């Protein structure tokens, strides 16, 4: 079925019906619909007028001979006939995410964390050809049937960001495979696999690496704020960076403790906490400077690293 | 050696067993030497240790303990398996060997020389089980890809030190001392100060995972005079003294439980000497417990400062 | 609310209404307005005629496939339908000034004199998306929430 491939679960449909859009590069069937009734069409307006189109032959993939627009039987004439609207194939967006959420495309992920990866994409030509996913190892060998996980190889349009196999996307597993760079190629089912119709995403499988904390400097004086960097974490996830209250100066009150970490950059929240309660920057009902145990900053890493900062005032000279 | 044989194009699968191969290629296969790295040689009973090693040609591994008998499994994880990365390396850090339900943990919970081995999880089962078998004999453990190492578990050791300024303490109103030492094999340590007048104070310190503890800025809220400090750590049994305090719970007496007993000593008409004698008799000498203590003494004197000598930059003292 | 984001204090609005302008790069919502009633539109005159536009997909950021102009349902036909006027996003001007007045952008100012700096800008796309300000140190770290002073991070057009 044209427009609705899921009606008959087909991966494609080339039976053109009056008025339905047709994309570049399609090899239109000439056995039904406009493919046999009106094999020849003429452009109507704009750059399309005058220019002819032949359904009996594949449509060129470039606009230099088939300008975009509406094509009629009468063309520029006032008569309205079975028409064809020509567009261009295009993949709007695509991403690789984890079952808990969070884009991980192009980033480095450990083997254990790649258990239930999902691939989603939004494109233009769902009405004609479903998009298809091919997974290739660093050597380029197809491994699609070995890493496929309980779903077909066809991604429905829309449903971008879906983390479940209930609707849209394709579920893949990369835990079995070794470390390396794996290429995910999205392309048309039959014909639309040129230019904007195809995409090549990358994924990096690596060994389980510890969360690395780094400072821009080692020896600093009081009052000089220092920026710290968290690396090797899962993208779109929350870490906690903690400071022992013992290093805090004794004369410091709750407010000084509640401002050791700054709200700079990727930092999501700053406060103090003990084993039973927390006092954030937005409240004072939590533990006091003595009641609390440590100072903490909840940081949400975006991409491959996160950046936060600390004010070194009200700290012991050790 | 093992060979792959290509056959003529168009031949059927069943019929191909008869005709000779059009061509073939041979290659060699060798076994993988799985072994452990971290647990070897000396070990401290009750202390958490890391587990790591190499598991080439394996996906999951299991750990067994042996002493003149079969190898017994340890319930390290829910599935009793450790995954192997793409680098043929496995690791499971900060596990308490003596704090597990399996018989191997009980065997390792008593001081002595033992053996600890690693085996493949696929070779671990011997009856088609989907999980690691509980017990394997010597022949079963040796036949599969496995390795072993000699381990020697020893008793816990305790040491400590107080930061006395001159053998005395800061002003009595806010007397402050610091403590440091090594308490390998334990999870928490207690410190108690007792004056001559029968007043008691206590503090709980969480020892680091490496066995070293260091606490600073401890307030001694006692009266001026001679004050004795005791540092206490529970032994293997994790119970203070006999485990049956004269008050409160009579089983599983922890340091927190001992704080309840301490809270009654001060209210009594006893002096410092009597309190020290009672605590020494109950915590240590009762039923020959495994708990370990150390002692220190100091005078909680008032603030004082004086000048000793004055001289030019020459030979004078 | 389209056109008037301050009506509901929203930072954006993607519910297109008949006749309201639409800028390049917008990801038009398909749940209300023209996003669901007429997902497909056809150009009317000029370079726009013939060329098609799909609200179900993001509008390209370049004019090479979506020429500027008015788009109808009937396109070049005489019938007038819910239309969409396509323009280009543009920031006309922007400046950094002191509370006493005087542009200080790009110049060198002492630390004490930066007590109450103001940032203003006039742009084109206030009817769709409010502009937003991000402050970065020499190392590029975001410091917006640390230097913000009693106002939001959205600059109104004009003023
Ligand atoms: C396109 O859709 C028609 C309608 O069901 C079907 O008959 C063709 O087989 C398919 O290609
Ligand atoms: C193009 O042709 C369709 C029918 O194929 C008609 O519905 C439209 O009005 C015309 O522009
Ligand atoms: C944590 O702080 C709360 C007060 O916020 C206190 O009630 C708890 O005893 C402490 O652990
Ligand atoms: C756009 O404006 C409409 C009208 O109030 C509102 O319902 C939508 O939520 C907003 O995006
Ligand atoms: C475009 O469409 C609007 C209504 O959406 C109409 O008011 C104009 O006259 C037309 O050009
Ligand atoms: Ca016509
Ligand atoms: Ca007792
Ligand atoms: Ca004991
Ligand atoms: Ca019109």
* C-alpha B247 to ligand 7 mean position (Å): 9
Give kind and range of the element (H or E) at residue B65. strand B60-66
- Residues from C contacting A (CB-CB < 8 Å) are 40, 42-43, 47-52, 54, 57-58, 65, 75-76, 139, 141-143, 145-146
Burial of A131 (0-12, 13-18, 19+ CB in 10 A): buried
- How far apart (Å, rounded) are the C-alpha atoms in residues A130 and A188? 6
φ/ψ of residue B138, rounded to 5: -65, -45
Residues of chain B neighbouring A178 (CB-CB closer than 8 A):
86
Contact C3, C30 (CB under 8 A): no
Give me the sign of the Cα torsion angle C72, C74, C79, C82: negative
Q: Strands C22-23 and C84-87, how do they pair?
A: parallel
**DSSP-derived secondary structure for A189-248:** SSS--SGGG-EEEEEEEE---PPEEEES-SS--TT--EEEEEES--TTEEEEEEEETTSB
Question: What is the side-by-side order of every strand in the sheet holding A91-97?
Answer: A91-97, A117-123, A170-172
Q: CA–CA separation, B270 vs C72, rounded Å?
A: 99
Query: Is the Cβ–Cβ distance between C55 and C86 less than 8 Å?
Result: no
A297 token code pair: 């900053």
DSSP 8-class letter at A312: -
| CB neighbours of residue C158 within 10 Å | 10
- CA-nearest of C72, C91, C81 to C23 is C91
The size of chain A, in residues, is 318
**Cβ distance A267 to A261 under 8 Å?**
yes
Experimental method: cryo-EM
CA-CA distances (angstroms) from residue B271 to A158, B196, B267, B293? 81, 6, 11, 21
CA distance C3 to chain A (A): 26
Cα torsion B101, B103, B108, B109: sign: positive
CA distance A127 to C81: 25
- Could you tell me the strand order of the sheet in which A180-188 lies? A108-110, A199-206, A180-188, A131-136, A154-155
Q: Are A111 and B86 in contact (CB < 8 Å)?
A: yes
Q: Half-sphere exposure of residue A299, counting CA atoms within 13 Å on the CB side?
A: 30
Gap between the Cα atoms of A56 and A62, Å rounded: 17
Name all residues whose Cβ lies below 6 A of ligand 3. Answer: A 274-277, 286-287, 291
Instruction: Output the six-digit token pair for A318.
Output: 């050790």
Give Cα C19 distance to the centre of its chain. Answer: 16
Q: Which helix (H) or strand (E) holds B256?
A: helix B255-265
Between chains, do A85 and C52 touch, taking CB under 8 Å as contact?
yes
Within a 10 A sphere around the Cβ of C152, how many other Cβ atoms?
Answer: 12
- Of all ligands present, the nearest one to the C-alpha of B258 is 7
Length of chain B: 317
- Check CB contact under 8 Å for C142 and A264: yes
Q: For residue A111, what is the DSSP state?
A: T
Contact A88, A196 (CB under 8 A): yes
Nearest-CB residue to C65 (from A49, A88, A263): A88
For this entry, resolution in Å reads 3.5
Query: Could you tell me if the CB of C19 is within 6 A of ligand 5?
Result: yes
Query: Two tokens at B229?
Result: 């400090």
Residue whose entry in the numeric block shows the structure tokens 């520029």:
A76
Q: Which residue of C has its CA nearest to A262?
A: C146
3-state secondary structure chain C: CCCCHHHCCCCECCCCCCCCCEECCCCCCCCCCHHHHCCEEEECCHHHECCEEECCCCCCCCCCCCCCEEEECCCCCCCCCCCEEEECCCEEEEEEECCCCCECCCCCCCCHHHCCCEEEEEECCCCCECEECCCECCCCCECHHHHCCCCCCEECCCC
Determine the distance in angstroms separating the CA of A90 from the nearest CA of chain B, rounded to an integer.
37
Cβ–ligand 5 distance for C80 under 6 Å, the answer yes
φ and ψ of A155, to 5 deg: -100, 125
Task: Give A123 Cα–ligand 4 centroid separation in angstroms.
Answer: 26
- How many CB pairs below 8 A link A and C? 60
b/e burial code for range B263-294 (CB count within 10 A of at least 16 → b): eebeeeebebeebbeebeebbbebeebbbbbb
Q: A275 vs chain B: nearest CA distance in angstroms?
A: 13
Q: What values do phi and psi take at C35, rounded to 5?
A: -60, -25
């Amino acid at each position: 079925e044209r427009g609705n491939l899921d009606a008959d679960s087909e991966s494609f449909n080339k039976t053109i019906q009056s008025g339905d859009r047709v994309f570049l590069g399609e090899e239109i069937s000439t056995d039904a619909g406009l493919g046999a009734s009106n094999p020849l069409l003429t452009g109507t307006a704009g750059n399309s007028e005058g220019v002819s189109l032949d359904l009996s032959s594949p449509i060129p993939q470039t606009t230099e001979n088939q300008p975009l627009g509406t094509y009629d039987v009468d063309g520029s004439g006032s008569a309205t006939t079975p028409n064809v609207t020509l567009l261009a194939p295009r993949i709007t967006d695509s991403e690789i995410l984890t079952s808990s959420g969070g884009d991980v495309t192009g980033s480095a992920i450990s083997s254990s964390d790649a258990g239930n990866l999902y691939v989603n994409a939004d494109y233009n030509y769902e009405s004609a050809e479903k998009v298809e996913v091919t997974v290739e190892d660093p050597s380029g060998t197809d491994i699609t049937n070995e890493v496929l996980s309980g779903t077909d190889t066809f991604v429905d349009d829309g449903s971008i960001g879906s983390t479940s196999s209930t609707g849209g996307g394709v579920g893949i597993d990369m835990s079995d495979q070794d470390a390396g760079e794996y290429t995910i190629i999205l392309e048309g089912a039959e014909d639309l696999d040129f230019g904007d119709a195809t995409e090549t995403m990358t994924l990096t499988i690596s060994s389980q690496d510890e969360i690395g904390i780094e400072l821009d400097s080692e020896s600093v004086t009081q009052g000089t704020d220092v920026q710290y960097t968290v690396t090797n974490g899962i993208d779109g996830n929350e870490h906690v960076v903690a400071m022992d209250l013992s290093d805090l100066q004794n004369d410091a009150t709750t407010e000084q403790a509640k401002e050791v970490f700054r709200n700079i950059g990727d930092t999501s929240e700053v406060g103090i906490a003990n084993s039973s309660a927390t006092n954030t920057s937005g409240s004072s009902t939590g533990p006091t400077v003595e009641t609390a145990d440590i100072a903490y900053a909840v940081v949400e890493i975006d991409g491959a690293s996160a950046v936060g900062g600390i004010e070194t005032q009200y700290l012991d000279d050790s | 050696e093992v060979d792959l044989e290509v056959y003529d194009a168009g031949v059927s699968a069943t019929a191909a067993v008869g005709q000779d191969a059009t061509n073939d290629i041979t290659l060699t296969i060798e076994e993988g030497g799985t072994t452990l790295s971290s647990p070897t040689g000396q070990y401290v009973v009750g202390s958490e240790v890391d587990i790591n090693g190499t598991a080439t040609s394996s996906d999951s591994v299991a750990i067994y303990v042996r002493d003149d008998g079969d190898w017994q499994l340890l319930e390290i994880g829910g599935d009793n398996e450790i995954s192997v990365d793409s680098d043929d390396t496995f690791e499971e850090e900060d596990i308490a060997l003596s704090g597990l339900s399996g018989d191997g943990s009980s065997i390792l919970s008593l001081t002595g020389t033992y053996r600890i081995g690693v085996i493949d999880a696929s070779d671990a089962d011997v009856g088609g089980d989907g999980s690691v078998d509980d017990s394997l004999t010597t022949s079963e453990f040796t036949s599969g890809v496995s390795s072993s190492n000699s381990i020697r578990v020893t008793d816990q050791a305790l040491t400590g030190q107080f930061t006395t300024i001159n053998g005395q303490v800061a002003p009595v109103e806010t007397g402050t001392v610091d403590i440091n030492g090594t308490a390998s094999g334990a999870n928490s340590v207690l410190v108690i100060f007792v004056d001559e007048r029968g007043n008691v104070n206590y503090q709980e310190v969480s020892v680091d995972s490496d066995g070293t503890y260091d606490e600073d800025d401890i307030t001694v809220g006692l009266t001026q005079g001679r004050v004795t400090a005791h540092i206490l750590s529970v032994g293997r049994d994790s119970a203070i003294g006999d485990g049956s305090l004269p008050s409160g719970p009579s089983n599983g007496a922890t340091l927190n439980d001992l704080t309840g007993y301490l809270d009654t000593l001060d209210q009594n008409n006893n002096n410092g000497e009597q309190i020290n004698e009672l605590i020494a008799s109950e915590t240590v000498d009762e039923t020959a417990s495994d708990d370990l203590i150390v002692t220190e003494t100091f005078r909680l004197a008032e603030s004082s400062t004086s000048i000793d000598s004055i001289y030019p930059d020459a030979a004078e003292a």
